[PDB]
């Protein structure tokens, strides 16, 4: 029982650290995508 609690606590810790990882990933990827379509728009508007 004790060792199961320890292992599950460790699983919780791993999940939390990965969670932080995923927020950072989402933030950067969203920024990059947004900037990308902005670039497309500004390129397009320059045409006509």
């Amino acid at each position: 029982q004790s060792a199961r609690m320890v292992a599950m606590k460790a699983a919780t810790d791993n999940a939390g650290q990965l969670i932080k990882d995923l927020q950072l990933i989402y933030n950067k990827l969203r920024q990059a995508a947004i900037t990308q379509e902005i670039s497309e728009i500004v390129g397009g508007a320059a045409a006509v």
């Binding site: 379509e37 497309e40 728009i41 397009g44 508007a45 045409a47 006509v48």
Partner: protein, 463 residues
């Protein structure tokens, strides 16, 4: 009088005219050298106009004479249209000789008024157990047929048109909207085998015709069906006509491409900025009235399997029902391959289908999602350590999935190709009996490749 070419850019055509007389939008423009034709897009002042060519671009030099028509395109409609395959210009392309009737009507028209709309909602049914159970429809509906990667959806649409033809003279026509040719060719072949041409006419957008042609074949078929339903016969009564679209997404993409060259910025995502207007124009022009019912089925393929781009959302803004499939269940030896968990019909209500039908659907879906939530324990622990609780549910889910089997009257030929179309009453009776566990003592194979409870029980006696 007449105009001359002043600029050619891809599909964009520009012609000068006398300011005394300038053709108006959507009117026909006859090339005086060839049979290629044009329509009006933007009146550019001083006799200048931006236009698009209905046919190949080759053969055209600046300052070349082109005559006007002062009228949009009127393409022929009538009984003579049946069994005829013609261009976007309403001219026979199937080598079936010249058309017969002169009843031709301008392609572009208005939107139906609010008052004139049909004020009710009558159930539309297929006779197929899985569909009518999960996606019942309303006479005048519009259903999306998503994806397609395990078997030909065309088989299913042919089944539907079998249902319609054997059902009524409520007409139906499919239009090739970005169809890859083999579909249309073979399709045609089984059509003339079934000899259903006396109920259908045909047009192809072939990904090769000018984008305007492939963009306006939609309006072409729309107008044809519009008349044909609105053609009241012997009763002051119109039929219930169904139309089929190879892919509206092809139309959307075509319009998206063409929009920019008009000097128009694209949508935010890059699509045509005018997708919604034209799309909804189509949709409201697809509506049952007090004069017959207008309904359509649209085989849609989601780009990149993402539903967040504007096009699928716009479809949902009109999708009366959503039918998705899976290659896996098709590989499960299942004819429909219908998604019983992510295909829905808006008209799925204890009123429109009745409370009993609604709740039976509820019960079936609950059994199925219980099975899927069971699959984890099923795989991990096996089948034994789980007590008989929910094991009857597993049996029910499996025998329901196998019960989903309707031998199609055209099915790649495994069961003699029969048309089941068992009445919904028998279907619901059998399904509720299965949910109850009345025949939970009978193998799923008894439900496999069979229709009614008579069929299931006779199969169980056989196996």
């Amino acid at each position: 009088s007449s105009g001359r070419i002043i600029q050619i850019i891809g599909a964009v055509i520009d012609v000068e005219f006398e300011r005394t007389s300038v053709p108006k939008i959507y009117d026909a423009l006859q090339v005086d050298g060839t049979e290629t034709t044009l329509e009006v897009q933007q009146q550019l002042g001083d006799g200048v106009v931006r236009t698009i060519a209905m046919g190949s671009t080759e053969g055209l030099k600046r300052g070349l004479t082109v005559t006007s028509t002062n009228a949009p395109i009127s393409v022929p409609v009538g009984t003579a249209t049946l069994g005829r395959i013609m261009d976007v210009l309403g001219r026979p392309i199937d080598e079936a000789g010249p058309v017969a009737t002169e009843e031709r009507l301008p392609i572009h028209r208005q939107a139906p008024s609010y008052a004139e709309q049909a004020a009710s909602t009558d159930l539309l049914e297929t006779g197929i157990k899985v569909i009518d159970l999960l996606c019942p429809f309303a006479k005048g509906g519009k259903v999306g047929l998503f994806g397609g990667a395990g078997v030909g959806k065309t088989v299913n649409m042919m089944e539907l048109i079998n249902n319609i033809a054997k059902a009524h003279s409520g007409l139906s026509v499919f239009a090739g909207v970005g169809e890859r040719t083999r579909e249309g060719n073979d399709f045609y072949h089984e059509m003339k085998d079934s000899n259903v041409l006396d109920k259908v006419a045909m047009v192809y957008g072939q990904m090769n015709e000018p984008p305007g042609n492939r963009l306006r074949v939609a309006l072409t078929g729309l107008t044809m069906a519009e008349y044909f339903r609105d053609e009241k016969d012997e009763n002051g009564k119109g039929r219930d006509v169904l139309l089929f679209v190879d892919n509206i997404y092809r139309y959307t993409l075509a319009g998206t491409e063409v929009s920019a060259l008009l000097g128009r910025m694209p949508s935010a995502v890059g699509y045509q900025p005018t997708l919604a207007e034209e799309m909804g124009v189509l949709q409201e022009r697809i509506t049952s009235t007090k004069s017959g019912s207008i309904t359509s089925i649209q085989a849609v393929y989601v780009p990149a399997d993402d539903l967040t781009d504007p096009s699928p959302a716009t479809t949902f803004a009109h999708l009366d029902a959503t039918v998705v499939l899976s290659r896996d269940i098709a590989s499960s030896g299942i004819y429909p391959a219908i998604d019983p968990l992510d295909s829905t019909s808006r008209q799925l209500d204890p009123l429109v289908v009745g409370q009993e039908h609604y709740e039976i659907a509820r019960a079936v879906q609950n059994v199925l999602q219980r099975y899927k939530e069971l699959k984890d324990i099923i795989a991990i622990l096996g089948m034994d350590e789980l007590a008989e609780e929910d094991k009857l549910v597993v049996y029910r889910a499996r025998k329901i999935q196998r019960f989903f089997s309707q031998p199609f009257h055209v099915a790649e030929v495994f069961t003699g190709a029969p048309g089941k179309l068992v009445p919904l009453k028998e279907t619901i009776r059998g399904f509720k009996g299965l949910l109850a566990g009345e025949y939970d003592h009978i193998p799923e194979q008894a439900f496999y490749m069979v229709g009614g409870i008579d069929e299931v029980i006779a199969k169980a006696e056989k196996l």
